[PDB]
Amino acid sequence: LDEDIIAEENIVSRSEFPESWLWNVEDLKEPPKNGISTKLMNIFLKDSITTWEILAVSMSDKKGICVADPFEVTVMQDFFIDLRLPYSVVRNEQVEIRAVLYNYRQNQELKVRVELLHNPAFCSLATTKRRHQQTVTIPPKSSLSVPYVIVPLKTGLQEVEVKAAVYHHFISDGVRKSLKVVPE
Amino acid sequence: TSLPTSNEYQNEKLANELKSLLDELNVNELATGSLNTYYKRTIKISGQKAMYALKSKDFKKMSEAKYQLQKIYNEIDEALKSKY
Amino acid sequence: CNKFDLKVTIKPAPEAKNTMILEICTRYRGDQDATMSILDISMMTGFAPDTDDLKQLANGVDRYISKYELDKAFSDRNTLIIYLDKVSHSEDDCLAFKVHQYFNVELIQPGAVKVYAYYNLEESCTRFYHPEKEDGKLNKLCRDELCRCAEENCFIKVTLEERLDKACEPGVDYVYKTRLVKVQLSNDFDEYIMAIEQTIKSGSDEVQVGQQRTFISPIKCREALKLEEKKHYLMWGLSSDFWGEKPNLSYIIGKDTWVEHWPEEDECQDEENQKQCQDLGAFTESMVVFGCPN
Amino acid sequence: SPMYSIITPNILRLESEETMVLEAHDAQGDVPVTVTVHDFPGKKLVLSSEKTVLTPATNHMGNVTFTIPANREKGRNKFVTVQATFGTQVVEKVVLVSLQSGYLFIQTDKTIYTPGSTVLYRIFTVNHKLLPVGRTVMVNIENPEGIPVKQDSLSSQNQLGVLPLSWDIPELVNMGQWKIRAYYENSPQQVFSTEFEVKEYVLPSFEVIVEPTEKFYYIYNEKGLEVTITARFLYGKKVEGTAFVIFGIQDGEQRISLPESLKRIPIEDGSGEVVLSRKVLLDGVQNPRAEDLVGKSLYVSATVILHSGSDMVQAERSGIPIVTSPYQIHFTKTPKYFKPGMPFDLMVFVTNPDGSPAYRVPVAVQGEDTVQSLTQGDGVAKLSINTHPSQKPLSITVRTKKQELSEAEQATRTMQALPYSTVGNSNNYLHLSVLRTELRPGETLNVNFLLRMDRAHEAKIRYYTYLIMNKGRLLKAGRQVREPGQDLVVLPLSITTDFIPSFRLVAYYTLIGASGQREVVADSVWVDVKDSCVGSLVVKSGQSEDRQPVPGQQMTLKIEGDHGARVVLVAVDKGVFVLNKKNKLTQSKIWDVVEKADIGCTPGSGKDYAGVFSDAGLTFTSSSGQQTAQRAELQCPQPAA
């Protein structure tokens, strides 16, 4: 934690992955200009690293039901993790989750100490005191997949969480997805 | 004594610009509490950049970082204004 | 499993001192030979496939590995897909390739092999492999349904105060001197019916001196162990090592527990065992009359 | 001899404003008129309030505005008798009415949900003018075996036509596209439905797209069907991986896979090439003589795998047509009746096989080699032929004429147009030649009014009476004045957004002539205008310029729309759409709901004066008794091909 690198204590993971959101209802109460009313809106994107697609319908007793085009808002990063979690595992069965490390930097592979977080609801390779990290190399414009065998120990809704940071850069991402443990 | 060299002057300005911020970092980090998770997620990484950058006494890392932290530091103000 | 068969043999190669053979034995449980199908491996951390052996594989027919994957330096290959053109319904269709540890690490994770016909994904089969661990299967401790972990170590220079320290932290709830009655074993988890000879510090277990309680451990920890029934023992651990409801409780051998062979009456007459037999006595009185400093 | 005419929509509607045109032909001074509707049969006096006078100022042309309530009144059409009394004279007609209130559209946040994920939905509620109205609506949520698992009853009042709603999908439940159904409490029969799939899935991190170089396959195409596979992450970035592709043939709903067409190709730099091959299909199913196949379709399923083994994606382009010609030819936008001697404007429709409009494609008729005309961006071609004044059916046959295609590869089609059948076979006609391009609101359209009759009664005709149907209601009804010796008069038609997506124009004149005979000559024309929101709505970016935003970052959204309008927002991880892209809301989907609800069933004209009127959604009843074939069928003529 003075190494040419971020420390895990400081990596605040993304976590909020709605497949949808922004189900609001604004009102164009503004002073019309060229008959066109304009509303500046403030919106906090969601953590997910993907493309969002905003859809808008308008109704105006005068002009009727509108069907605005879709509109594209790409949220991206030059480095980020993919936690590829299946739909559902089965308590006491030992499967393999992938983490896909994406590096989009133009030119210069990436060293990353990527670190599964010690869950108590998992027989990971991680313990209260002892962590689980690899320093691993991802060429540029490509992805290194870093598997992780785990065992889901309690039923209901657990949470995987990964973390990676890159050396010499000070870039870093963390990612907390949840999956569904179902009993035998 | 006399006066410092070129490098010498610039280097010491950057640094004590930089420090100037790291000083009132903690105050900032603390305002994130109310703010949406980005802010926290962001400032923490920006904070370290600095402190390592500052200690590293290298111009690049130091300015580059000087700026990172500047941005966020005002991505906070803008935030807290839409809330009173 | 059922739709697919999976024999995932990991043995070493005769003839570095660290490099080993991986063989994969698959069969389609059907009438026809399944069409195209995937072989999804991932190396045990710090292993990787010998480039020369994998080219050897693609160059054949019935198989193919994508050029993109043949490129990366043997090192960058920390996982890997092998496309099959067929997987007989008839017999095992096998293969194998030298893999090499290039990277010295303790706690090397279980590599795993996965398969399935492109068409349908659910109908997978996932064997695992490992050099030490029997079966790919992590060490986990299971009675009935419930399960807890057991990948930590087994136990752990020793002195009266190394002990009046290490046996007073939070976790410490029990501390017994116990003689061992029955020493069972099973292909899964071996247990110990040990009798408490003196309740040194009572815990969430209301057990009168002399009652028996049942301890368990991973079958993979037989080495650090060794057990001569009628041999007594000094042990202490945390309340989270308790197994199931009361008063049919049971104790979990894990890392936060501590284990030493307590000698015999006339076995402390030795001039080498005295360093211990004296440390113990004192610890007994020290734990009975006063308790812990904090 | 004065004559009074009554003109209404072919089919009225409840709880909405309708309009009917009052006219006084050849009468003097002010004429006061009272209009009344009664239930049929009998008397309920459902609407009498309205009164009006036809001043010599306004050339004796009347405005009727009325709203029929929905009192306690099936399977048998209900009717009404309209009654318009000019002075003492009393004309009336017996029309059809519908319980159909208007439309309903439903929106779901996603196209697909997992067990235990709530489904958000909006019911947009509107009248036949697509204006927000407020009624009471019932809403069911059927499971995939059709059984309502939940209903509510809601009023959309003052709610500006927008009913928010949700439903929490239970933890265990059948998968399988479900359905949300809603109807107006007034009219249960007109039900509205949107679907949504319930499945177990994780989102995919890229999309896969399959594409034939051609939108069809030519049977004699030695190369077989060529297809380019394309993968790219949701964050826009190219994919590396390998992909399994495989084909099949569809017949009706029936589907045969060609097991042998299975190919494994590398997906490099986000793309890959692959191709089913003729000899690959024939025998594939038992190589039973090609041709036959003609009419059937092809499909390709591709399945990509990242080299990391982490994430898979399937995707399939379906029903690619097996055709002997690239283009298809349609006369369903061309009328089926001409006027002998008069130029006939042909609206040929040229679709690619799939169904899409084909641009810049040449067309011409049987007879004349010199006549050609391309296809504007709407898959439409305007050709005009001068017809002979012969009382003989005029059979036309058009044919594609693209260079680089063999005369066997070209596509044709034939239609049959009958002459306009006049009154007493007098030979009096009216033609409306309208310049035909992509009309747009604001642009001004010229309606050529061309008079065809023996100068004998030419001086008599003083004026043309015109009308505009739109979304099946009257949008305007006016007069175009004429002076003797004139055969052509041009009508300046301003074109506002109120015309979208298509409007009908029916002009008629009337006179006494030949042997004291009361006459009506007329003409109807359809003009599909450029379809697009009636007001506007756009959602662009806030920060004029910027780099990509970052996970959790603030971004300013910009919404440019009609003053006072309501907007309802939703943003969806496009990864969903890689699992299901069906059943989304489109404005184009709405225009499609509105056209299929047209009461007018013909592109143009009428077999007789009285057809022009029933073909567009209209009735003409006059004092002199010249009324139109009553309309007592709700839907248009069941397609007879």
Curated annotation (Swiss-Prot), chain A:
This is Complement C3c alpha' chain fragment 1. It comes from Homo sapiens (Human).
From Swiss-Prot, chain B:
Residues 30-47 are annotated as: Essential for activity. Its main location: secreted. It is found in: Secreted. Keywords: Secreted, Signal, Virulence. One of its GO terms (cellular component) is extracellular region. The keyword Transmembrane does not apply. It comes from the Bacteria. The keyword Secreted applies. Involved in countering the first line of host defense mechanisms. Efficiently inhibits opsonization, phagocytosis and killing of S.aureus by human neutrophils. Acts by binding and stabilizing human C3 convertases (C4b2a and C3bBb), leading to their inactivation. The convertases are no longer able to cleave complement C3, therefore preventing further C3b deposition on the bacterial surface and phagocytosis of the bacterium. Also prevents C5a-induced neutrophil responses. Belongs to the SCIN family. This is Staphylococcal complement inhibitor. The gene is scn. The chain holds residues 33 to 116 of 116 of the full protein.
